[PDB]
mmCIF file of N, CA and C in Angstrom:
data_model
loop_
_atom_site.group_PDB
_atom_site.id
_atom_site.type_symbol
_atom_site.label_atom_id
_atom_site.label_comp_id
_atom_site.label_asym_id
_atom_site.label_seq_id
_atom_site.Cartn_x
_atom_site.Cartn_y
_atom_site.Cartn_z
ATOM 1 N N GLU A 1 141.768 39.762 142.655
ATOM 2 C CA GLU A 1 140.696 38.732 142.771
ATOM 3 C C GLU A 1 141.260 37.363 142.385
ATOM 4 N N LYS A 2 140.419 36.371 142.286
ATOM 5 C CA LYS A 2 140.910 35.015 141.912
ATOM 6 C C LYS A 2 141.275 35.005 140.424
ATOM 7 N N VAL A 3 142.134 34.109 140.021
ATOM 8 C CA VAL A 3 142.541 34.048 138.586
ATOM 9 C C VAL A 3 141.740 32.965 137.863
ATOM 10 N N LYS A 4 141.167 33.288 136.730
ATOM 11 C CA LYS A 4 140.386 32.261 135.987
ATOM 12 C C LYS A 4 141.362 31.241 135.401
ATOM 13 N N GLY A 5 141.209 29.994 135.743
ATOM 14 C CA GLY A 5 142.136 28.960 135.203
ATOM 15 C C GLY A 5 141.809 27.602 135.822
ATOM 16 N N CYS A 6 142.312 26.547 135.244
ATOM 17 C CA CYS A 6 142.035 25.191 135.787
ATOM 18 C C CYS A 6 143.275 24.654 136.501
ATOM 19 N N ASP A 7 143.098 24.118 137.678
ATOM 20 C CA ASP A 7 144.257 23.566 138.429
ATOM 21 C C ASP A 7 144.143 22.041 138.496
ATOM 22 N N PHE A 8 144.988 21.340 137.792
ATOM 23 C CA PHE A 8 144.930 19.851 137.823
ATOM 24 C C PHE A 8 145.769 19.347 138.996
ATOM 25 N N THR A 9 146.300 20.248 139.777
ATOM 26 C CA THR A 9 147.146 19.837 140.932
ATOM 27 C C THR A 9 146.427 20.118 142.255
ATOM 28 N N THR A 10 145.406 20.934 142.244
ATOM 29 C CA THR A 10 144.700 21.239 143.522
ATOM 30 C C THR A 10 143.230 21.567 143.249
ATOM 31 N N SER A 11 142.335 20.775 143.764
ATOM 32 C CA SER A 11 140.882 21.053 143.546
ATOM 33 C C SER A 11 140.554 22.433 144.123
ATOM 34 N N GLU A 12 141.234 22.812 145.169
ATOM 35 C CA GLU A 12 140.979 24.143 145.793
ATOM 36 C C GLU A 12 142.196 25.041 145.561
ATOM 37 N N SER A 13 142.352 25.541 144.367
ATOM 38 C CA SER A 13 143.530 26.405 144.071
ATOM 39 C C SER A 13 143.351 27.784 144.705
ATOM 40 N N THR A 14 144.189 28.116 145.645
ATOM 41 C CA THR A 14 144.107 29.454 146.289
ATOM 42 C C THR A 14 144.494 30.510 145.250
ATOM 43 N N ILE A 15 144.745 30.086 144.039
ATOM 44 C CA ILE A 15 145.141 31.046 142.973
ATOM 45 C C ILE A 15 144.187 30.931 141.776
ATOM 46 N N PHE A 16 143.806 29.733 141.407
ATOM 47 C CA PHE A 16 142.886 29.575 140.238
ATOM 48 C C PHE A 16 141.453 29.352 140.732
ATOM 49 N N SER A 17 140.492 29.916 140.051
ATOM 50 C CA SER A 17 139.069 29.758 140.471
ATOM 51 C C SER A 17 138.569 28.336 140.188
ATOM 52 N N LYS A 18 139.169 27.638 139.259
ATOM 53 C CA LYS A 18 138.681 26.260 138.954
ATOM 54 C C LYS A 18 139.787 25.231 139.213
ATOM 55 N N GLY A 19 139.477 24.196 139.949
ATOM 56 C CA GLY A 19 140.495 23.144 140.233
ATOM 57 C C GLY A 19 139.832 21.763 140.203
ATOM 58 N N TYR A 20 140.590 20.737 139.927
ATOM 59 C CA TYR A 20 140.010 19.364 139.881
ATOM 60 C C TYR A 20 140.765 18.455 140.854
ATOM 61 N N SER A 21 140.135 17.405 141.311
ATOM 62 C CA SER A 21 140.815 16.476 142.256
ATOM 63 C C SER A 21 141.431 15.319 141.466
ATOM 64 N N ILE A 22 142.418 14.665 142.013
ATOM 65 C CA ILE A 22 143.052 13.532 141.279
ATOM 66 C C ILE A 22 142.009 12.442 141.024
ATOM 67 N N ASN A 23 140.974 12.396 141.817
ATOM 68 C CA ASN A 23 139.925 11.358 141.612
ATOM 69 C C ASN A 23 138.996 11.782 140.471
ATOM 70 N N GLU A 24 138.461 12.968 140.546
ATOM 71 C CA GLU A 24 137.535 13.441 139.474
ATOM 72 C C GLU A 24 138.170 13.217 138.098
ATOM 73 N N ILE A 25 139.449 13.447 137.966
ATOM 74 C CA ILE A 25 140.100 13.248 136.640
ATOM 75 C C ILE A 25 140.163 11.753 136.321
ATOM 76 N N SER A 26 139.905 10.917 137.291
ATOM 77 C CA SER A 26 139.944 9.448 137.036
ATOM 78 C C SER A 26 138.516 8.918 136.891
ATOM 79 N N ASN A 27 137.557 9.607 137.449
ATOM 80 C CA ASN A 27 136.144 9.147 137.341
ATOM 81 C C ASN A 27 135.287 10.279 136.767
ATOM 82 N N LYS A 28 134.928 11.232 137.584
ATOM 83 C CA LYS A 28 134.090 12.363 137.092
ATOM 84 C C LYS A 28 134.893 13.192 136.086
ATOM 85 N N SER A 29 135.201 12.626 134.951
ATOM 86 C CA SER A 29 135.985 13.379 133.929
ATOM 87 C C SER A 29 135.191 14.613 133.490
ATOM 88 N N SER A 30 135.746 15.396 132.609
ATOM 89 C CA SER A 30 135.028 16.619 132.142
ATOM 90 C C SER A 30 133.862 16.222 131.236
ATOM 91 N N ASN A 31 134.128 15.973 129.982
ATOM 92 C CA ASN A 31 133.035 15.575 129.048
ATOM 93 C C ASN A 31 133.292 14.156 128.532
ATOM 94 N N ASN A 32 134.407 13.940 127.890
ATOM 95 C CA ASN A 32 134.715 12.579 127.367
ATOM 96 C C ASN A 32 134.842 11.598 128.537
ATOM 97 N N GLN A 33 135.647 10.581 128.389
ATOM 98 C CA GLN A 33 135.809 9.596 129.495
ATOM 99 C C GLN A 33 137.133 9.851 130.220
ATOM 100 N N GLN A 34 138.212 9.963 129.491
ATOM 101 C CA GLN A 34 139.528 10.216 130.142
ATOM 102 C C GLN A 34 139.966 11.656 129.862
ATOM 103 N N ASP A 35 139.875 12.082 128.632
ATOM 104 C CA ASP A 35 140.284 13.472 128.290
ATOM 105 C C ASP A 35 139.611 14.449 129.257
ATOM 106 N N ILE A 36 140.382 15.169 130.022
ATOM 107 C CA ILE A 36 139.777 16.141 130.977
ATOM 108 C C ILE A 36 139.822 17.538 130.355
ATOM 109 N N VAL A 37 138.693 18.174 130.206
ATOM 110 C CA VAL A 37 138.686 19.532 129.597
ATOM 111 C C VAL A 37 138.123 20.553 130.586
ATOM 112 N N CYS A 38 138.826 21.634 130.792
ATOM 113 C CA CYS A 38 138.323 22.682 131.723
ATOM 114 C C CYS A 38 137.758 23.834 130.893
ATOM 115 N N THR A 39 136.466 23.912 130.773
ATOM 116 C CA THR A 39 135.861 25.017 129.971
ATOM 117 C C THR A 39 135.498 26.185 130.892
ATOM 118 N N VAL A 40 136.060 27.338 130.644
ATOM 119 C CA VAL A 40 135.749 28.519 131.496
ATOM 120 C C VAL A 40 135.591 29.750 130.602
ATOM 121 N N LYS A 41 134.918 30.760 131.077
ATOM 122 C CA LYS A 41 134.740 31.988 130.251
ATOM 123 C C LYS A 41 135.727 33.062 130.712
ATOM 124 N N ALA A 42 136.556 33.538 129.822
ATOM 125 C CA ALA A 42 137.546 34.582 130.210
ATOM 126 C C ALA A 42 136.965 35.969 129.926
ATOM 127 N N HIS A 43 137.552 36.995 130.483
ATOM 128 C CA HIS A 43 137.034 38.372 130.244
ATOM 129 C C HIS A 43 138.206 39.334 130.023
ATOM 130 N N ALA A 44 137.981 40.398 129.297
ATOM 131 C CA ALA A 44 139.076 41.373 129.032
ATOM 132 C C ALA A 44 139.685 41.843 130.358
ATOM 133 N N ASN A 45 138.928 41.806 131.418
ATOM 134 C CA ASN A 45 139.469 42.253 132.736
ATOM 135 C C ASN A 45 139.849 41.032 133.573
ATOM 136 N N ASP A 46 139.240 39.907 133.309
ATOM 137 C CA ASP A 46 139.550 38.684 134.099
ATOM 138 C C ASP A 46 140.932 38.150 133.713
ATOM 139 N N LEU A 47 141.705 37.725 134.676
ATOM 140 C CA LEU A 47 143.053 37.176 134.358
ATOM 141 C C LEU A 47 142.896 35.726 133.890
ATOM 142 N N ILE A 48 143.706 35.291 132.962
ATOM 143 C CA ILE A 48 143.582 33.888 132.474
ATOM 144 C C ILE A 48 144.906 33.143 132.676
ATOM 145 N N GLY A 49 144.837 31.882 133.004
ATOM 146 C CA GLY A 49 146.084 31.088 133.208
ATOM 147 C C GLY A 49 145.714 29.663 133.632
ATOM 148 N N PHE A 50 146.685 28.845 133.936
ATOM 149 C CA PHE A 50 146.374 27.450 134.361
ATOM 150 C C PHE A 50 147.627 26.796 134.950
ATOM 151 N N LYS A 51 147.478 25.650 135.562
ATOM 152 C CA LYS A 51 148.658 24.965 136.161
ATOM 153 C C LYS A 51 148.468 23.445 136.099
ATOM 154 N N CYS A 52 149.538 22.718 135.927
ATOM 155 C CA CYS A 52 149.447 21.229 135.857
ATOM 156 C C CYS A 52 150.416 20.635 136.888
ATOM 157 N N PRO A 53 150.134 19.460 137.394
ATOM 158 C CA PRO A 53 151.007 18.793 138.402
ATOM 159 C C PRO A 53 152.471 18.741 137.948
ATOM 160 N N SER A 54 153.388 18.682 138.877
ATOM 161 C CA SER A 54 154.834 18.652 138.515
ATOM 162 C C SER A 54 155.216 17.293 137.921
ATOM 163 N N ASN A 55 154.354 16.320 138.012
ATOM 164 C CA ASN A 55 154.692 14.976 137.458
ATOM 165 C C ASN A 55 154.203 14.865 136.010
ATOM 166 N N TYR A 56 153.537 15.870 135.510
ATOM 167 C CA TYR A 56 153.044 15.815 134.108
ATOM 168 C C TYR A 56 153.885 16.734 133.215
ATOM 169 N N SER A 57 153.835 16.529 131.926
ATOM 170 C CA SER A 57 154.630 17.386 130.997
ATOM 171 C C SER A 57 153.720 18.453 130.387
ATOM 172 N N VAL A 58 154.190 19.666 130.275
ATOM 173 C CA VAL A 58 153.331 20.736 129.695
ATOM 174 C C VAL A 58 153.597 20.881 128.192
ATOM 175 N N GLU A 59 152.599 20.624 127.392
ATOM 176 C CA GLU A 59 152.744 20.760 125.911
ATOM 177 C C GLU A 59 151.628 21.679 125.413
ATOM 178 N N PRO A 60 151.958 22.706 124.670
ATOM 179 C CA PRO A 60 150.937 23.659 124.159
ATOM 180 C C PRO A 60 150.175 23.100 122.956
ATOM 181 N N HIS A 61 148.917 22.801 123.125
ATOM 182 C CA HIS A 61 148.122 22.275 121.983
ATOM 183 C C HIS A 61 147.479 23.465 121.271
ATOM 184 N N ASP A 62 147.252 24.526 121.995
ATOM 185 C CA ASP A 62 146.646 25.744 121.396
ATOM 186 C C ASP A 62 146.819 26.903 122.380
ATOM 187 N N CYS A 63 147.978 27.002 122.981
ATOM 188 C CA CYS A 63 148.234 28.099 123.960
ATOM 189 C C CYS A 63 148.263 29.449 123.233
ATOM 190 N N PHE A 64 148.907 30.440 123.801
ATOM 191 C CA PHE A 64 148.929 31.779 123.138
ATOM 192 C C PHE A 64 150.337 32.136 122.641
ATOM 193 N N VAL A 65 151.350 32.012 123.461
ATOM 194 C CA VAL A 65 152.720 32.388 122.986
ATOM 195 C C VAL A 65 153.066 31.549 121.757
ATOM 196 N N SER A 66 152.870 30.264 121.837
ATOM 197 C CA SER A 66 153.164 29.380 120.675
ATOM 198 C C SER A 66 152.336 28.105 120.822
ATOM 199 N N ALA A 67 151.614 27.718 119.808
ATOM 200 C CA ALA A 67 150.783 26.490 119.936
ATOM 201 C C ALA A 67 150.147 26.131 118.590
ATOM 202 N N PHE A 68 149.355 25.089 118.564
ATOM 203 C CA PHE A 68 148.698 24.676 117.295
ATOM 204 C C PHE A 68 147.306 25.310 117.237
ATOM 205 N N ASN A 69 146.989 25.992 116.169
ATOM 206 C CA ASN A 69 145.652 26.647 116.078
ATOM 207 C C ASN A 69 144.563 25.585 115.925
ATOM 208 N N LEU A 70 143.339 26.003 115.745
ATOM 209 C CA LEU A 70 142.229 25.021 115.593
ATOM 210 C C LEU A 70 142.484 24.172 114.344
ATOM 211 N N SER A 71 143.233 24.690 113.410
ATOM 212 C CA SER A 71 143.532 23.915 112.172
ATOM 213 C C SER A 71 144.690 22.961 112.456
ATOM 214 N N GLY A 72 145.261 23.052 113.626
ATOM 215 C CA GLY A 72 146.397 22.157 113.978
ATOM 216 C C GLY A 72 147.694 22.729 113.404
ATOM 217 N N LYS A 73 147.701 23.994 113.077
ATOM 218 C CA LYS A 73 148.934 24.615 112.514
ATOM 219 C C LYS A 73 149.658 25.389 113.622
ATOM 220 N N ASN A 74 150.964 25.343 113.642
ATOM 221 C CA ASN A 74 151.718 26.069 114.706
ATOM 222 C C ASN A 74 151.878 27.544 114.322
ATOM 223 N N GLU A 75 151.205 28.422 115.019
ATOM 224 C CA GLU A 75 151.312 29.878 114.703
ATOM 225 C C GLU A 75 151.202 30.695 115.998
ATOM 226 N N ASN A 76 151.974 31.738 116.115
ATOM 227 C CA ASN A 76 151.912 32.579 117.352
ATOM 228 C C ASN A 76 150.499 33.165 117.487
ATOM 229 N N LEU A 77 150.019 33.321 118.693
ATOM 230 C CA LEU A 77 148.649 33.886 118.890
ATOM 231 C C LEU A 77 148.740 35.391 119.172
ATOM 232 N N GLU A 78 149.914 35.960 119.082
ATOM 233 C CA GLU A 78 150.054 37.419 119.355
ATOM 234 C C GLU A 78 149.407 38.221 118.225
ATOM 235 N N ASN A 79 149.600 37.814 117.002
ATOM 236 C CA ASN A 79 148.984 38.560 115.867
ATOM 237 C C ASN A 79 147.462 38.560 116.036
ATOM 238 N N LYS A 80 146.928 37.562 116.695
ATOM 239 C CA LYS A 80 145.456 37.501 116.904
ATOM 240 C C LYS A 80 145.077 38.379 118.099
ATOM 241 N N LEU A 81 145.810 38.274 119.172
ATOM 242 C CA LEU A 81 145.506 39.095 120.380
ATOM 243 C C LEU A 81 146.817 39.599 120.988
ATOM 244 N N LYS A 82 146.890 40.856 121.327
ATOM 245 C CA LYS A 82 148.145 41.394 121.919
ATOM 246 C C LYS A 82 148.129 41.174 123.434
ATOM 247 N N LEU A 83 148.559 40.026 123.881
ATOM 248 C CA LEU A 83 148.575 39.745 125.346
ATOM 249 C C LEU A 83 149.707 40.536 126.015
ATOM 250 N N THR A 84 149.514 40.929 127.247
ATOM 251 C CA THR A 84 150.564 41.710 127.960
ATOM 252 C C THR A 84 150.878 41.035 129.299
ATOM 253 N N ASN A 85 151.991 41.363 129.898
ATOM 254 C CA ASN A 85 152.340 40.747 131.212
ATOM 255 C C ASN A 85 152.301 39.223 131.088
ATOM 256 N N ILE A 86 152.982 38.683 130.117
ATOM 257 C CA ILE A 86 152.991 37.204 129.936
ATOM 258 C C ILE A 86 153.982 36.558 130.916
ATOM 259 N N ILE A 87 153.551 35.537 131.616
ATOM 260 C CA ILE A 87 154.451 34.850 132.590
ATOM 261 C C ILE A 87 154.526 33.357 132.243
ATOM 262 N N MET A 88 155.703 32.840 131.998
ATOM 263 C CA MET A 88 155.818 31.388 131.659
ATOM 264 C C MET A 88 156.775 30.694 132.638
ATOM 265 N N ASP A 89 156.250 29.890 133.525
ATOM 266 C CA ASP A 89 157.120 29.175 134.505
ATOM 267 C C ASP A 89 157.042 27.671 134.235
ATOM 268 N N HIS A 90 158.031 27.119 133.587
ATOM 269 C CA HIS A 90 158.008 25.660 133.284
ATOM 270 C C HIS A 90 158.270 24.841 134.552
ATOM 271 N N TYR A 91 159.096 25.330 135.438
ATOM 272 C CA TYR A 91 159.385 24.559 136.682
ATOM 273 C C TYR A 91 158.089 24.348 137.467
ATOM 274 N N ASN A 92 157.297 25.374 137.621
ATOM 275 C CA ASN A 92 156.022 25.218 138.375
ATOM 276 C C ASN A 92 154.914 24.808 137.404
ATOM 277 N N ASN A 93 155.220 24.760 136.134
ATOM 278 C CA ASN A 93 154.197 24.356 135.129
ATOM 279 C C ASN A 93 152.957 25.250 135.248
ATOM 280 N N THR A 94 153.140 26.543 135.310
ATOM 281 C CA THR A 94 151.967 27.459 135.426
ATOM 282 C C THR A 94 152.106 28.600 134.410
ATOM 283 N N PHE A 95 151.037 28.941 133.731
ATOM 284 C CA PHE A 95 151.112 30.035 132.721
ATOM 285 C C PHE A 95 150.037 31.091 133.009
ATOM 286 N N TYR A 96 150.371 32.349 132.865
ATOM 287 C CA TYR A 96 149.370 33.429 133.120
ATOM 288 C C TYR A 96 149.444 34.469 131.995
ATOM 289 N N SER A 97 148.333 35.060 131.642
ATOM 290 C CA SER A 97 148.345 36.102 130.571
ATOM 291 C C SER A 97 147.297 37.172 130.895
ATOM 292 N N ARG A 98 147.572 38.410 130.574
ATOM 293 C CA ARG A 98 146.589 39.492 130.877
ATOM 294 C C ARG A 98 145.809 39.845 129.604
ATOM 295 N N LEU A 99 144.506 39.859 129.681
ATOM 296 C CA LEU A 99 143.679 40.182 128.479
ATOM 297 C C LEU A 99 143.433 41.692 128.413
ATOM 298 N N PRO A 100 143.517 42.281 127.246
ATOM 299 C CA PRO A 100 143.251 43.735 127.079
ATOM 300 C C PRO A 100 141.971 44.146 127.814
ATOM 301 N N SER A 101 141.579 45.383 127.709
ATOM 302 C CA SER A 101 140.345 45.828 128.416
ATOM 303 C C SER A 101 139.130 45.644 127.502
ATOM 304 N N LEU A 102 139.351 45.315 126.256
ATOM 305 C CA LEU A 102 138.205 45.149 125.318
ATOM 306 C C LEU A 102 138.383 43.882 124.471
ATOM 307 N N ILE A 103 137.374 43.055 124.412
ATOM 308 C CA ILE A 103 137.455 41.813 123.583
ATOM 309 C C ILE A 103 136.047 41.445 123.104
ATOM 310 N N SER A 104 135.765 41.619 121.842
ATOM 311 C CA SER A 104 134.405 41.283 121.331
ATOM 312 C C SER A 104 134.485 40.050 120.427
ATOM 313 N N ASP A 105 135.656 39.506 120.248
ATOM 314 C CA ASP A 105 135.794 38.307 119.371
ATOM 315 C C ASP A 105 135.437 37.041 120.154
ATOM 316 N N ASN A 106 134.981 36.024 119.473
ATOM 317 C CA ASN A 106 134.620 34.753 120.165
ATOM 318 C C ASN A 106 135.771 33.756 120.013
ATOM 319 N N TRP A 107 136.983 34.238 119.966
ATOM 320 C CA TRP A 107 138.143 33.318 119.786
ATOM 321 C C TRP A 107 138.295 32.402 121.001
ATOM 322 N N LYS A 108 138.825 31.227 120.787
ATOM 323 C CA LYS A 108 139.027 30.266 121.907
ATOM 324 C C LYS A 108 140.431 29.659 121.791
ATOM 325 N N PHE A 109 140.979 29.183 122.872
ATOM 326 C CA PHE A 109 142.343 28.579 122.812
ATOM 327 C C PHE A 109 142.506 27.603 123.978
ATOM 328 N N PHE A 110 143.413 26.666 123.883
ATOM 329 C CA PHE A 110 143.571 25.697 125.010
ATOM 330 C C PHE A 110 145.004 25.159 125.095
ATOM 331 N N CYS A 111 145.387 24.710 126.268
ATOM 332 C CA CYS A 111 146.753 24.144 126.472
ATOM 333 C C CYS A 111 146.596 22.705 126.972
ATOM 334 N N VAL A 112 147.595 21.873 126.821
ATOM 335 C CA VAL A 112 147.434 20.464 127.282
ATOM 336 C C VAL A 112 148.638 19.997 128.109
ATOM 337 N N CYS A 113 148.395 19.097 129.028
ATOM 338 C CA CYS A 113 149.485 18.527 129.872
ATOM 339 C C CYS A 113 149.379 17.003 129.779
ATOM 340 N N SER A 114 150.462 16.298 129.578
ATOM 341 C CA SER A 114 150.332 14.815 129.464
ATOM 342 C C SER A 114 151.694 14.118 129.539
ATOM 343 N N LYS A 115 151.671 12.813 129.512
ATOM 344 C CA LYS A 115 152.923 12.005 129.547
ATOM 345 C C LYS A 115 152.625 10.647 128.913
ATOM 346 N N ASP A 116 153.624 9.864 128.627
ATOM 347 C CA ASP A 116 153.360 8.528 128.026
ATOM 348 C C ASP A 116 152.445 7.724 128.958
ATOM 349 N N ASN A 117 151.616 6.875 128.411
ATOM 350 C CA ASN A 117 150.700 6.066 129.268
ATOM 351 C C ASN A 117 150.137 6.941 130.399
ATOM 352 N N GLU A 118 149.427 7.987 130.072
ATOM 353 C CA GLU A 118 148.869 8.875 131.137
ATOM 354 C C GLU A 118 147.662 9.653 130.599
ATOM 355 N N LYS A 119 146.611 9.749 131.373
ATOM 356 C CA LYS A 119 145.409 10.511 130.914
ATOM 357 C C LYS A 119 145.831 11.943 130.557
ATOM 358 N N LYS A 120 145.396 12.442 129.432
ATOM 359 C CA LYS A 120 145.791 13.825 129.026
ATOM 360 C C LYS A 120 144.848 14.857 129.657
ATOM 361 N N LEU A 121 145.380 15.991 130.044
ATOM 362 C CA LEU A 121 144.533 17.055 130.662
ATOM 363 C C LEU A 121 144.441 18.246 129.701
ATOM 364 N N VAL A 122 143.253 18.654 129.342
ATOM 365 C CA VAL A 122 143.117 19.802 128.394
ATOM 366 C C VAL A 122 142.571 21.041 129.117
ATOM 367 N N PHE A 123 143.212 22.166 128.929
ATOM 368 C CA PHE A 123 142.747 23.432 129.566
ATOM 369 C C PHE A 123 142.194 24.341 128.462
ATOM 370 N N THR A 124 140.944 24.734 128.529
ATOM 371 C CA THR A 124 140.398 25.589 127.435
ATOM 372 C C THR A 124 139.541 26.738 127.977
ATOM 373 N N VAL A 125 139.617 27.874 127.331
ATOM 374 C CA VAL A 125 138.804 29.056 127.745
ATOM 375 C C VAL A 125 138.223 29.705 126.482
ATOM 376 N N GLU A 126 137.185 30.487 126.611
ATOM 377 C CA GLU A 126 136.588 31.128 125.402
ATOM 378 C C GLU A 126 136.311 32.610 125.673
ATOM 379 N N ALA A 127 136.371 33.426 124.654
ATOM 380 C CA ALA A 127 136.106 34.881 124.843
ATOM 381 C C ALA A 127 135.763 35.513 123.491
#
């Protein structure tokens, strides 16, 4: 099926269910004015991932393999959730992770893409 994730490179991602246009990120932002946030609901069976344009830099603000937690501390997210089939492609700037078959926790996490003098893009999901 389609993969749950935000595509900042294609409003119609033939791979991600959620995508944004280069214009919407400049006008119809997510919630704030420039900060673009993609809020989506993930599921133990739904696949989770995201992708950013090749002209932007991928920096983990709260990803899963390694990132800053809600406290802003750098800690692996594996001890929190045992993700499987992890795929990390920096050249294509796309990340995918498989969620177990059971998840009753309301944990949330997000990744960010940005560059100097450039609107930052935030990818976030909750489960």
